[PDB]
């Protein structure tokens, strides 16, 4: 796994030693190049995962998230340069460096062979994000939302540290491969009930979970387009990774502890979908929309059915590709009207023909149009709930409906409408803007041709 870590590092001198005007190109050229080598990680095996050394390893589940992250760095740069053109030379190198490190932590995160090492990198991954969101934020309203991240450490990380340590002392090791064979039946006790909360509450907040989501709508409202993409495309997906792996040792306790979590989503999905119809912001509408899809994953992981895991893998993938594109698509308008309000500009299909083609294209797969992977996973999970419980179909049906209702509305409100008379800076779509969307939509469909690469490890 070193063959991808060092060249990722090597971008840092390239980001710095490079000439003045080739800073963007050089990283873009190689960053795209590295992802090509990333595809090599698809050498999975039917019975065994891929174990390089004691420090990194990637199974079938890990790789698809790895490809998305590496595939996503160049796309983040493309959108970035428009708003950074005015910034001075030194800072751009600073911002670009954080992404390179952000990718470095991520790629090492999902490939980590030892849980604590994963725990360490998990905490590290946040640090670049906070700078990016804060240092180059889009607002100055001082929301004072620190308590949420303080709450994260209090109810999340910090408890997780103790439980991880406790397991090692008791079981004798935290190497996931060892855990496969030394996993012990976790009987019922008040201590274990406390241990269980330590292994999961940390990942629930990041997904996020309904009720615990207050940071996400306000995190995107301020994070720049460069910061937003990784957050919803990668950072949200960290929790599922650990939750899928960590849940290896929480049985049978999870058989009843999941219900308060399951109910939060099952009902959480509808609540978020409805509010989006009321939202007054392109990004915020996507925010809760993000909570919607992530809610489905939580249910899949907890029930731990062979189909749940398969469907969960694509939902993170498709949503990551979906929302990431939506932010870029939404941020395309921001490049003209410099606003997040959804009603300030309307009828843009009258002036941005090819832009609307993406809008219609992206929205189609947002609501899980068949046979796209957006629906393969989402439709995979819906069936699994039926064996767990037949009643669940009511909420999934309602959620899909409303998710189909607001998804087309946002498209309807903006593109299908009458142009704003006073607006007078709707310039034609630039090559960069259209190119960025195209890189998103295209592979999203291609994977539909071959589903065997994001089916998860159960396949």
């Amino acid at each position: 796994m070193l063959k991808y870590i060092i060249p990722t590092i090597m971008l840092m001198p390239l980001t710095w030693l490079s000439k003045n005007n080739m800073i963007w190109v050089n990283s873009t050229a190689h960053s795209l190049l590295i992802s090509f080598t990333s595809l090599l990680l698809m050498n999975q095996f039917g019975d065994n995962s891929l174990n390089f050394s004691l420090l990194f390893f990637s199974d079938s589940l890990s790789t698809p998230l790895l490809i998305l992250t590496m595939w996503l760095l160049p796309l983040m740069l493309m959108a970035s340069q428009h708003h950074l053109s005015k910034e001075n030379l030194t800072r751009k190198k600073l911002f670009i460096t954080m992404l390179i490190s952000l990718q470095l932590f991520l790629i090492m995160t999902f490939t980590a062979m030892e849980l604590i090492l994963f725990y360490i990198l998990f905490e590290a991954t946040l640090v670049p994000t906070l700078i990016i969101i804060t240092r180059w934020g889009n607002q100055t309203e001082r929301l004072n939302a620190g308590l949420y991240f303080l709450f994260y450490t209090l109810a999340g990380s910090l408890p997780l540290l103790v439980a991880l340590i406790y397991i090692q002392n008791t079981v004798g090791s935290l190497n996931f491969l060892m855990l496969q064979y030394w996993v012990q039946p976790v009987h019922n006790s008040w201590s274990n009930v406390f241990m269980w909360l330590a292994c999961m509450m940390a990942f629930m907040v990041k997904m996020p979970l309904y009720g615990l989501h207050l940071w996400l709508p306000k995190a995107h409202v301020e994070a720049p387009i460069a910061g937003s993409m990784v957050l919803a495309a990668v950072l949200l997906k960290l929790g599922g990774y650990g939750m899928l792996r960590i849940t290896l040792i929480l049985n049978p306790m999870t058989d009843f502890m999941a219900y308060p979590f399951i109910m939060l989503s099952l009902w959480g999905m509808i609540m978020t979908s409805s509010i989006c119809l009321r939202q007054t912001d392109l990004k915020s509408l996507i925010a809760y929309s993000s909570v919607s899809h992530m809610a489905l994953v939580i249910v899949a992981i907890l029930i731990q059915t062979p189909w749940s895991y398969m469907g969960a893998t694509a939902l993170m993938i498709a949503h990551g590709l979906t929302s990431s594109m939506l932010f870029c698509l939404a941020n395309s308008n921001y490049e003209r009207i410099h606003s997040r309000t959804m009603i300030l500009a309307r009828g843009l299909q009258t002036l941005l023909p090819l832009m609307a083609t993406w809008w219609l294209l992206a929205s189609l797969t947002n609501l899980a149009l068949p046979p796209t992977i957006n629906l393969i996973g989402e439709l995979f999970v819906v069936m699994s709930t039926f064996s767990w419980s037949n009643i669940t179909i009511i909420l999934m049906g309602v959620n899909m409906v409303i998710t189909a209702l607001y998804s087309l509305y946002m498209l309807i409100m903006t593109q299908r409408g009458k142009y704003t008379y006073h607006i007078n800076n709707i310039s034609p779509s630039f090559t960069r803007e259209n190119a960025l969307m195209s890189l998103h939509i295209l592979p999203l469909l291609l994977l539909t041709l071959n589903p065997k690469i994001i089916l998860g490890p159960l396949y």
Binding site: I343, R346, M413, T420, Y421
Partner: protein, 156 residues
């Protein structure tokens, strides 16, 4: 680059504070009044009519005839939901309760009458479409090992 004072704020509990809010959104002091002071916390925003956009005249040459909204006008707290696309509260053609109860009649009428017909359906006074071979026990895949009860529908 907008002043703090010209933004939604607390509930004004005295007319003197209410003077700004009405003025703030270009609503004369008479037309202005906010939600009751409670935990609802909707701020010093006004209480505009619960009406849709289609009700407003389109013949006027608005800045935004699409929305039938003029620049500088206030917006209903849920004016987004009252837009032409969304819920419309234009005058209705027929009486409200009767309109709702006009639906109630026909739909409620039919459901039970089916159950009335279910007890006494309609048919023809003829016997079964007789079949050979043990009432098609074997044609329906019936187990050959265990023969069915003999069936012979005699002539007449």
């Amino acid at each position: 680059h907008i002043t703090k004072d010209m933004l939604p704020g607390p509930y004004p509990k005295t007319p003197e504070e209410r003077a700004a809010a009405a003025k703030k959104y270009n609503m004369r002091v008479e037309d202005y009044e906010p939600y009751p002071d409670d935990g609802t916390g909707y701020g010093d925003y006004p209480k505009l009519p619960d009406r849709s956009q289609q009700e407003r005249d389109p013949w006027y040459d608005w800045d935004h005839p699409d929305l039938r909204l003029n620049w500088g006008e206030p917006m209903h707290w849920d004016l987004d939901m009252y837009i032409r696309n969304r819920v419309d509260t234009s005058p209705t053609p027929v009486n409200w309760n009767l309109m709702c109860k006009h639906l109630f009649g026909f739909v409620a009428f039919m459901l039970f009458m089916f159950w009335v017909g279910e007890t006494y359906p309609a048919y023809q006074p003829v016997g079964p479409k007789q079949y050979p071979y043990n009432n098609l026990y074997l044609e329906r895949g019936g187990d050959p090992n265990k023969e069915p009860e003999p069936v012979v529908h005699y002539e007449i």
